[PDB]
Design a protein around this motif. Structure first.
Motif, PDB file in Angstrom:
ATOM      1  N   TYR A   1       0.847  -1.187   0.000  1.00 41.03           N
ATOM      2  CA  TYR A   1       0.000   0.000   0.000  1.00 41.03           C
ATOM      3  C   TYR A   1       0.879   1.231   0.000  1.00 41.03           C
ATOM      4  CZ  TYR A   1      -3.608   3.425   0.539  1.00 41.03           C
ATOM      5  OH  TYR A   1      -4.464   4.474   0.274  1.00 41.03           O
ATOM      6  N   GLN A   2       0.479   2.240  -0.787  1.00 36.57           N
ATOM      7  CA  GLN A   2       1.263   3.453  -1.013  1.00 36.57           C
ATOM      8  C   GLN A   2       0.537   4.625  -0.366  1.00 36.57           C
ATOM      9  OE1 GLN A   2      -0.992   1.480  -3.243  1.00 36.57           O
ATOM     10  NE2 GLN A   2       0.679   1.640  -4.762  1.00 36.57           N
ATOM     11  N   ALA A   3       1.041   5.084   0.782  1.00 38.92           N
ATOM     12  CA  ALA A   3       0.574   6.366   1.294  1.00 38.92           C
ATOM     13  C   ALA A   3       1.054   7.497   0.398  1.00 38.92           C
ATOM     14  CB  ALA A   3       1.040   6.571   2.735  1.00 38.92           C
ATOM     15  N   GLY A   4       2.240   7.340  -0.195  1.00 42.32           N
ATOM     16  CA  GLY A   4       2.831   8.358  -1.042  1.00 42.32           C
ATOM     17  C   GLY A   4       2.195   8.441  -2.413  1.00 42.32           C
ATOM     18  N   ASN A   5       1.665   9.613  -2.743  1.00 42.33           N
ATOM     19  CA  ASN A   5       1.074   9.860  -4.056  1.00 42.33           C
ATOM     20  C   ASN A   5       2.113   9.690  -5.161  1.00 42.33           C
ATOM     21  OD1 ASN A   5       2.664  12.019  -3.465  1.00 42.33           O
ATOM     22  ND2 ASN A   5       1.033  13.565  -3.565  1.00 42.33           N
TER      23      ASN A   5
ATOM     24  N   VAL B   1       9.246   3.415   3.077  1.00 41.26           N
ATOM     25  CA  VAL B   1       8.789   4.401   4.102  1.00 41.26           C
ATOM     26  C   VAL B   1       7.278   4.598   3.993  1.00 41.26           C
ATOM     27  CG1 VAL B   1       9.102   6.750   5.017  1.00 41.26           C
ATOM     28  CG2 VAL B   1      11.065   5.514   4.103  1.00 41.26           C
ATOM     29  N   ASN B   2       6.798   5.065   2.841  1.00 40.16           N
ATOM     30  CA  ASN B   2       5.339   5.256   2.642  1.00 40.16           C
ATOM     31  C   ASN B   2       4.803   4.064   1.852  1.00 40.16           C
ATOM     32  OD1 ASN B   2       5.330   7.557   4.210  1.00 40.16           O
ATOM     33  ND2 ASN B   2       4.370   8.859   2.667  1.00 40.16           N
TER      34      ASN B   2
END
Lengths: 192, 230
Positions: A139-143, A151-152
């Motif tokens: 899963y990507q928190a980072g756009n 990290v993200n």
């Protein structure tokens, strides 16, 4: 004869994110077989008295089985909320069946850490009751994650990593949830 | 890159009404539950409300039920908190918060707006102040019940320096987000979770807050100040 033995005496149990389910049908059910499986840390039925089970006829019995840590056994119960109840094993609110848990520090804890028993850590939407989700998508928190969980970038399963010196709150516990289903189809799981 | 901008704060009379606004960017808004948290005068951090990723589920702190209405508009990447029947108790700095992880019961908040002051005018237990000397080791208590701290493994600690929002430093009882140095540790026994700080630098003269899942879809905080004696 219904093979409740095979559920309770299996060598290893499933991770709760990928729990097993044994349908149990066209068989004679002697629930006394259950009693002789070591003291149970939990044996809380729902919609049925355990002491009457040999008088009852069901059209299916489902046997679900998995391993969670001690403090989380609270979450295997109707209406529960949290990591396990909402992302691994949800029970419906009109549940009829039994939840049976027992400490298995002896079979599942290892001194270098048992990382093979895993839970799902997060999930955008909760499981419908009795739903199962075998996914492992990062899963990507980072756009931009690819095969890199950093990290993200987030892997959605984690490991209990059981060790014999953990307090009983974090020791492995084997759960069998038994779901007694009642349709109009001729009852095929009865007593003797 | 994640940015939460709040807006709407104004002086209101009791009985009054007011709609706060959050603007989100830097993450896929469409996936997360979104929370509101408030910073009361004197009394620390107070969880308010949360709304599921699609708007179908909303929960509320008891102090707020049926006077506040959380809602969202993903097409605008926005999150609103409509307030009615305002009271003195509601005077606070209102934060817009997104949790570390997706899912409705995510219990760690790493993203916080700056907060929008809301003034109305015509609880887990923490040590108020604690004190250690540079290099020594302090610890901070967080006492709740067997329905919040003692119930779940979702205890978090947040640090806050003046003019900044809370920074998440401990999550899930014993975990540390990237960049938190390991002289910050956390533990939990019974209904009491503890933050311990070793190797004490003076850049740790700040405030320290805990939060626990409290069952249903509900959270609770506390409040505590550290002075590094210089």
């Amino acid at each position: 004869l219904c093979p409740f033995d095979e559920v309770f005496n299996a060598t290893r149990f499933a991770s709760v994110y990928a729990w097993n389910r044994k349908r149990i049908s066209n068989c004679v059910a002697d629930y006394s077989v259950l009693y002789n499986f070591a003291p149970f840390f939990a044996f809380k039925c729902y919609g049925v008295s355990p002491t009457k089970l040999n008088d009852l006829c069901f059209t299916n019995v489902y046997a679900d089985s998995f391993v969670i840590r001690g403090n989380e056994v609270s979450q295997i119960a109707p209406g529960q909320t949290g990591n396990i109840a909402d992302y691994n094993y949800k029970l419906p609110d009109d549940f009829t069946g039994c939840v049976i848990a027992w400490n298995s520090n002896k079979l599942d804890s290892k001194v270098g850490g048992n990382y093979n028993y895993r839970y799902r850590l997060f999930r955008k939407s909760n499981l419908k009751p009795f739903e199962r989700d075998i996914s492992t998508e990062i899963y990507q928190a980072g756009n931009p994650c690819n095969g890199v969980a950093g990290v993200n970038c987030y892997f959605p399963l984690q490991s209990y990593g059981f060790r014999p010196t953990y307090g009983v709150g974090h020791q492995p516990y084997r759960v069998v949830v038994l779901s007694f289903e009642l349709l109009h189809a001729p009852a095929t799981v009865c007593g003797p | 890159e994640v940015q939460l901008v709040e807006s709407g704060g104004v002086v209101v009379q009791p009985g009054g009404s007011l709609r706060l606004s959050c603007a989100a960017s830097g993450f896929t808004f469409d996936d997360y539950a979104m929370h509101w948290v408030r910073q009361v005068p004197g009394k620390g951090l107070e969880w308010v409300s949360l709304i599921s990723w699609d708007g179908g589920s909303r929960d509320y702190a008891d102090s707020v039920k049926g006077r506040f209405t959380i809602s969202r508009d993903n097409s605008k990447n926005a999150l609103y908190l409509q307030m009615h029947s305002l009271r003195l108790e509601d005077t606070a700095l209102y934060y817009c918060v997104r949790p570390v992880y997706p899912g409705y019961s995510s219990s760690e908040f790493d993203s916080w707006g700056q907060g929008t002051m809301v003034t109305v005018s015509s609880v887990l237990t923490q040590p108020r102040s604690v004190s250690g000397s540079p290099g020594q080791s302090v610890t901070i208590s967080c006492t709740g019940t067997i329905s919040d701290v003692g119930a779940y493994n979702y205890v978090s600690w947040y640090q806050q320096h003046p003019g900044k929002a809370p920074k998440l430093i401990i999550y899930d009882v014993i975990e540390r987000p990237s960049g938190v140095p390991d002289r910050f540790s956390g533990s939990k026994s019974g209904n009491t979770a503890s933050l311990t700080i070793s190797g004490l630098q003076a850049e740790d003269e700040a405030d320290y807050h805990c939060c626990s899942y409290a069952g249903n879809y509900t959270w609770m905080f506390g409040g505590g100040t550290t002075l590094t004696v210089l």
